[PDB]
Design a protein around this ligand. Sequence first.
Ligand SMILES: O=S(=O)(O)C[C@H](O)[C@@H](O)CS(=O)(=O)O
Length: 313
Amino acid sequence: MIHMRTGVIGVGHLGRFHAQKYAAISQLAGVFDENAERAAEVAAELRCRAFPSVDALLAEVDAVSIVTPTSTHFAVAEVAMQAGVHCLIEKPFTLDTEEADALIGMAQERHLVLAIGHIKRVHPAIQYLRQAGFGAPRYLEAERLAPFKPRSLDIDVIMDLMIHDLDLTLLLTGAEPVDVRAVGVAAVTDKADMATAWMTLNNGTVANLAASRVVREPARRMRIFWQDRYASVDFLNNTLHIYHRGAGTVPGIPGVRDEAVDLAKRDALAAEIEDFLNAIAAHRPVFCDGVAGRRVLAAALQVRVAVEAFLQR
Ligand SMILES: O=S(=O)(O)C[C@H](O)[C@@H](O)CS(=O)(=O)O
């Protein structure tokens, strides 16, 4: 438990979970939401305050999570940083890279920790693969497929789904995109319901990333290819398999050993929030800062522009 005054700005569906975590691991002053009823129920459930304004929240805390709609991230984070308050912003960072540039600048001027909520970085399989030190993968192939739900029309297939694997790509490789091509399929509306991007980075890595909001059953998978290894990750079922050239148990693939990696299930959002607060308190680097958030944001905008161009021809 960290000794820190914390708050959440925006306590809808996911903001409430942020608030639960902060209440468990820090001194949660309370919450603010534009819908007063909703803040009031969140505060009643967590036994914190429901604040009458964002400013009165900010007066009583050192750090906040910002879990408001993406188009509001800039204005809210601007107010929060003007008050010298550190910020964990839910992904995606902002709507465009100029807002992200401005908040990075204001954060540096204020000597504030700026973290973006890119939860997939703290997934147990990704942590294990980073600690294995395999180097930059040469090829990544990923699928993020979500069933159509009443709210799916507000799911941006690139900015809300694919951005996870775009970010993972940029992190595991440490490289920058040189070429982005993409296709999209729009069934319900003019907006893509599924998209697939083919990204070439400046170290020669290729990422082949699919996302959909209209599938039957969920699917969250990533296959990763190095020169001497193959990693298969089921994010949903929390499983990891690593193949190397070996001693013969794998059917249909000769001369390879499949190592089933024993992954522990942990609370990802609790992990991300503890990391944010430790970064403030120890001055150590946070799991995903503003710079990385903007990197993936620029890539995702490239993908989306390509997708909308495909769909419009
Ligand atoms: O089980 S795995 O996760 O190892 C791969 C899948 O079986 C297959 O759908 C895709 S692949 O094997 O051709 O890359």
